[PDB]
């Protein structure tokens, strides 16, 4: 398991049950009601999946696809952004954007 950082979600990491990413003026919450909601900014954003399932969780994979699953692994919502195999990160940025970056192309060590 990878340690959590407040504004980051790396491949393999999971958010559920009102777990959230936090930035300066923004929050991205995988809510108890199965809606993924970015609070803040002009319009905000939502997966628009309220009540679509039970005990939903958010997971970023190692191809850069962000997925909401319910308790039985029924796909609720997908970012539909599959790309080349590797390490990915979702950053809730201080400017409000939630951006998936990857794969890794440089590192200081293993």
């Amino acid at each position: 398991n990878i340690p959590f950082t407040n504004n980051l979600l790396f491949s393999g990491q999971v958010l559920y049950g009102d777990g959230r990413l936090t930035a300066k003026n923004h929050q991205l919450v995988m809510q108890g009601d199965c809606n993924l909601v970015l609070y803040g900014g002009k319009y905000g954003w939502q997966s628009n999946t309220h009540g679509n399932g039970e005990h939903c969780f958010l997971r970023l994979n190692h191809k850069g696809e962000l997925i909401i699953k319910d308790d039985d692994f029924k796909t609720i919502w997908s970012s539909r952004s599959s790309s080349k195999q590797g390490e990915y990160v979702l950053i809730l940025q201080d400017d409000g954007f939630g951006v998936i970056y990857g794969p890794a192309i440089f590192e200081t060590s293993s």
Binding site: T5, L66, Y88, I105
Partner: protein, 109 residues
Amino acid sequence: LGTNYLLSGQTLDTEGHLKNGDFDLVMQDDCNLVLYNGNWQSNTANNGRDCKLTLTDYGELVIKNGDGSTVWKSGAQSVKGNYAAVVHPDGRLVVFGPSVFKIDPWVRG
């Protein structure tokens, strides 16, 4: 100063830091880019003054001195797009990209 990440187009100015937990990336007065507690440095001490860290549209970390002359490059590059350098909590500086997906709270959904 700021956060735990540098995006392409942003500058980490002289003595500016990026922090995640005990790991602190500092663009030093002596032009060395150093990841405190991370056993990494660019190794460019006394190679310039007023040095600055940038990240290119191809995901390369670049250090430049006061004049704008390139002191150091990370030497790993990918396609054109948006990139992010992150102080990973395991104490690595990692460049990720290009961007694959964006959640945007600033435009009509």
